Amino acid sequence: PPGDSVTVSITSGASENSCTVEKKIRRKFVGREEYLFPPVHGKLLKCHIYDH
Amino acid sequence: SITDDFTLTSPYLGFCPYCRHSAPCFSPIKIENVWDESDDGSIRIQVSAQFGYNQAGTADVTKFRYMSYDHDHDIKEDSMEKIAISTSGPCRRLGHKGYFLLAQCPPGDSVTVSITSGASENSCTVEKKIRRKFVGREEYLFPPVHGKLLKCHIYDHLKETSAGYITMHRPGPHAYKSYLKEASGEVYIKPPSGKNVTYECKCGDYSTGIVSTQTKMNGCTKARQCIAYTRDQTKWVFNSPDLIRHTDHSVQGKLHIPFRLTPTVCRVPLAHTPTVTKWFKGITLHLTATRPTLLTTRKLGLRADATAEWITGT
Amino acid sequence: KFHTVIPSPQVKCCGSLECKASSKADYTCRVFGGVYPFMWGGAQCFCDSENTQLSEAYVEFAPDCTIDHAVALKVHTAALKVGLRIVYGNTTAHLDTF
Amino acid sequence: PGAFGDIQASSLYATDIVARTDIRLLKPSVKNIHVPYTQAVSGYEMWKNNSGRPLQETAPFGCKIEVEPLRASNCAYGHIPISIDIPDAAFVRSSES
Amino acid sequence: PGAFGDIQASSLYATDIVARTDIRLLKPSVKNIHVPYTQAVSGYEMWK
Numbered sequence: 020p021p022g023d024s025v026t027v028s029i030t031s032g033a034s035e036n037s038c039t040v041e042k043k044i045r046r047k048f049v050g051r052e053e054y055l056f057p058p059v060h061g062k063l064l065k066c067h068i069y070d071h
Numbered sequence: 072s073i074t075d076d077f078t079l080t081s082p083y084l085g086f087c088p089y090c091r092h093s094a095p096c097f098s099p100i101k102i103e104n105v106w107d108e109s110d111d112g113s114i115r116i117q118v119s120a121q122f123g124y125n126q127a128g129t130a131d132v133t134k135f136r137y138m139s140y141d142h143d144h145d146i147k148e149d150s151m152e153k154i155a156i157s158t159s160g161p162c163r164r165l166g167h168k169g170y171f172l173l174a175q176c177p178p179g180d181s182v183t184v185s186i187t188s189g190a191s192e193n194s195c196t197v198e199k200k201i202r203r204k205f206v207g208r209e210e211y212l213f214p215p216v217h218g219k220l221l222k223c224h225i226y227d228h229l230k231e232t233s234a235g236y237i238t239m240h241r242p243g244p245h246a247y248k249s250y251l252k253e254a255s256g257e258v259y260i261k262p263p264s265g266k267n268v269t270y271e272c273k274c275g276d277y278s279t280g281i282v283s284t285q286t287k288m289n290g291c292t293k294a295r296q297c298i299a300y301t302r303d304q305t306k307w308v309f310n311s312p313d314l315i316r317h318t319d320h321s322v323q324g325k326l327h328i329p330f331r332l333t334p335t336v337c338r339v340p341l342a343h344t345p346t347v348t349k350w351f352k353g354i355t356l357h358l359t360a361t362r363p364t365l366l367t368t369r370k371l372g373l374r375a376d377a378t379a380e381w382i383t384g385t
Numbered sequence: 386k387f388h389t390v391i392p393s394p395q396v397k398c399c400g401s402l403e404c405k406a407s408s409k410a411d412y413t414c415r416v417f418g419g420v421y422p423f424m425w426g427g428a429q430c431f432c433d434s435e436n437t438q439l440s441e442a443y444v445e446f447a448p449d450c451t452i453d454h455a456v457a458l459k460v461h462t463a464a465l466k467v468g469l470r471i472v473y474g475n476t477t478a479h480l481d482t483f
Numbered sequence: 484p485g486a487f488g489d490i491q492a493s494s495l496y497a498t499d500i501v502a503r504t505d506i507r508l509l510k511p512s513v514k515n516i517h518v519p520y521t522q523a524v525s526g527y528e529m530w531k532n533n534s535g536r537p538l539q540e541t542a543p544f545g546c547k548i549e550v551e552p553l554r555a556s557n558c559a560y561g562h563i564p565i566s567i568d569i570p571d572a573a574f575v576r577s578s579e580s
Numbered sequence: 581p582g583a584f585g586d587i588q589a590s591s592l593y594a595t596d597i598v599a600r601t602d603i604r605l606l607k608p609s610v611k612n613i614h615v616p617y618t619q620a621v622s623g624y625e626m627w628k
Contacts, residue, residue, distance in 0.1 A: 055180055055198050056089045060512055060519035084425050086515050097425040097515070104388075108449040140425070217609055217616035224452050235448035243393060248427030273399060273431040296431045312518045315422070315429060316393035332452045343618045344604060346581075359582065359602075359620050367536065371545035371559065379536050385582045385621050386525045387490045387504055391518045410490060410502035422516040429516070438511065440518050444490060444502040451495055455527065457488065460553065467563070474573045 021046050073236050073325040077121060077169065078128030080239055080326065081146060081306035084138045085119045085313040089181075089196035099137035100184050102197045103170070103311065108332055110206045110223035113165060113175050114158075115330050117237075118184055118195075119311070122151060122167035123230075135167075137191060142249040143263050144301055149189055157183045158201050168230035168329045170237070170309065178203045207339040210362035214338040223337035232331035239307035239324045241317040250299035258291035260299055272297030359385050386453070388445040396422055396429060398436030409443035489526035581620040584627035 021044050028037045048054055049066040085101025103117040120137040124130055126148040135154065139145045156162040156172060159179030166173040172184070179201050185194040205211055206223045250268055252259035260282050262268040272278050274291035281302055291297055307323050308314060342364045346357035358366065360382045369377040387410075395402065398421075404414040419434035430436060464483065471478050484505035492500040509519035535541075539548040546555040581602040589597045606616035 056093065056196065059086065059088050059095055059515075059517060060509060086517065095513075095515070106447070106449060108447075108453050216612075216614060217606060219609075234451075240393070244429070245424065246426050246429045271431060277399075295428065295433070298428060298430055300426075310390070310392050312391040312393065313424075313516060314393045315424070315516060316395050320393065320395070328448050332449045334452070341606070341618075343602075343620070346602070357582070359618075361621075367540045369540060369542070369545075373543055373560075375541060375543040377536065377541045379540065385626065386527050387502060389504075389506070389520070389522060391520065394516055394518055396516075408499075410500040411504050411506055413506040413508055415508040417510055420511060421514070422511075423514040424516055438516075440508040440520070442506045442508060442518070442520050444500070444504050444506075446490075446492070446495060446500065454495065455487075455530075458553070463555075469565075471567060473567075473569050476573065 020044075073233070073327055075327065076128070077124050077130075079306060079324065080121070080128070080169075081242065081308055082120045082136055082138045083242075083308045083311060083314060085195075085311060087195040087197075089194075091185075091192070091194045096193075098193055098195050099140075099191060100186060100193060100195045101311075101313065102182060102184055102195050103309070105182050105197065105199045105201075107199075107201055107204075108224070109226045110204055110337060111175075111225045112204055113173055113226045113330075114182070114201060115226060115234075115328075116156065116172045116174065116182065116184060117170050118172060119170070119309075121169050122154065122172060123169070140191075142247055144245070144247070144304075147191065149186070149191065153186045153188050155183075155185045155187050157185070165226075165228050166230050166330060169326055171329050173226055173228070173330045176201050205339075206337045208365035208367075209340045209342055210364070211340050212362075215340045216338070218338045218340050220336040221339055222334055224332050224334050226330040227333045228330070230329040232329060232333065233327040234331040235328040236325040237328060238310050238322045239326055240310055240320055241323055242304040242306060242308045243315040243317045244298075244300040245304070245315075246298035246300045248294075251294040251297065252285075253294035256292055258288050258294045258297055260286040260288060260297075262299075263301070267302040268299045269302050270297055270299045357385070358382050386447045386450065388447045390443050390445050392441045394422070395439040395441075396420065396436060398422070398430040398438070399432035400435065400437065402437045402439045404439070407443070411442075411444045413440075413442045415440045484526070485523040485529065486526045487530040489523070581623070582626060583623040586620075586623040 023041065023043060024039050025042045026037055026039045029035050049064055082099065084097045084099055086095060087098040087101045088095055090096035090098055099120050101119040106115040120135055122135040123132050124136055125134045126136055126146055133151055134148050135151050136146050136148050139147045156164060156174040156176065158176035158181065160177050162174040162176040164172065164174050180198065181196050182199045182201065183194055183196045186192050206221055250261055252261050260268065260270050262282060262284065265283055267281050267283055269281050270279065272288060272291055273296045274289060278289065288297065343359040348355040363381040363383050365379065366382050367379050369375045402416050404416055417438045417440065420436045420438045421433065422429050422438065466481060466483050468481050484503050489504055490500065490502040505523040507521050509521065511517045511519055542548055542555065544558045544560045546558040549556055581600055586601050587597065587599040602620040604618050606618065608614050608616060
């Protein structure tokens, strides 16, 4: 989700720690219309995503 | 008339626009409607699962019934500690009956209903603007101890109160691809063990029938040109845009919509009393406001020049 | 506030459907040519592109409308009625006059 | 559509509701069964956001606007020509006073 | 009240503090024990 920081944590175990950096993550959308999550009905454009 | 016999009703599967994997999927916890007209921030959510009832449909507060993903078209029961509502943070569950949940939700841009554990772990997020609501002419975060009592309308926490009704219709056909075999070059109809399944095929001629066991059919080279669905289906389902209607789509029965919007008395803040400094034909108001407070003036003559302003700060 | 009621889609989906007329509020209908709809369970009928879907959409009253609603009124000439406190001698009389 | 009164009925429990809310039914694109639709905003909600201040606060002559029935109470305007026919017994002879 | 110097003393450890913050004590409206009050904002914080 959008925010001002990025944290990577080891939530348990002996080496429990964290690391926080200042990075601006903002909401991104494709096209000329704002959305929170993509709709079921729409038009299929070209968007670039990180391959899982 | 409106019935409360939920043995005659069944849950269904919807098409959620945002499942757990952030992709559209068929879900047993689809969110149909969200209502927020309560003055204390609560919301009423309609779901495709039935809460507060067991597998048989008899009332049991700790359990909810949902539609299985299996090919046997069954209804499954699970505990209600796995039902979680969230808008931006976790929401507090205030009641449940049938398709309806009541929750107190912080302001946010979406509504989520989840099953947090077990076999049927999923979510359903829909886009709804849940905004902070306050009663009166003074802003607040949570109601104060000291104030004046006004009239505010809230959702009743009791599930016996009814705010309307929803129409329940006959279950439509639900074709399952598991019921076609397509052995060598001809199609076979394979029922889910000994349950009657009806087939509709277009193998040159329109053919239909009911079968309890395996069947060869006639002149069907592909399994695409026939469909099969269970005949046993008789429990009513909601008028959902995600299901295919029966040829008899008449209102078979009616269910309540719980959590009626009833009038009660709220606690609203009383602002700091203004300091009035008087001069020739006029007044000065020294106004202390920690939250937006509404100052409204008007003249008591023919001209009623009326100022309205929301004031914060000194 | 209105409640958009979308019924369950009807697919006489090897053949064709006809739009009818209904008295429901803002009853909108549309017939779509070739659909081949899917659900959880795969293909919903047999013919490939001979499938017609009928979309219905009308409007209702929201369940919370019995509390949050507006009333539209036309108001004609107004009448004035007053309460008077005539005090004559040592007798006080209260009375309402048009 | 999109303005106050886009849905009308004689009563809340009436079966003769008339509405015009600009419902446009869209051609389905996805394979799963769907009714894609688009609609205008609620005229009631739009008016609620743009209603202004009520007559209870914009009334002239210090009128108190009240409902059930609709009335404007305690309005200070004009003059009233009262005519009183006082009973005879109230008056006393000029000798008695 | 509401301006810089609404609380004044010769020192921080003084027993002769003088102030004017417009404390208004309100009538208790609820059944439980309560001292309702309202006050002007801190002049020091406003000046800050």
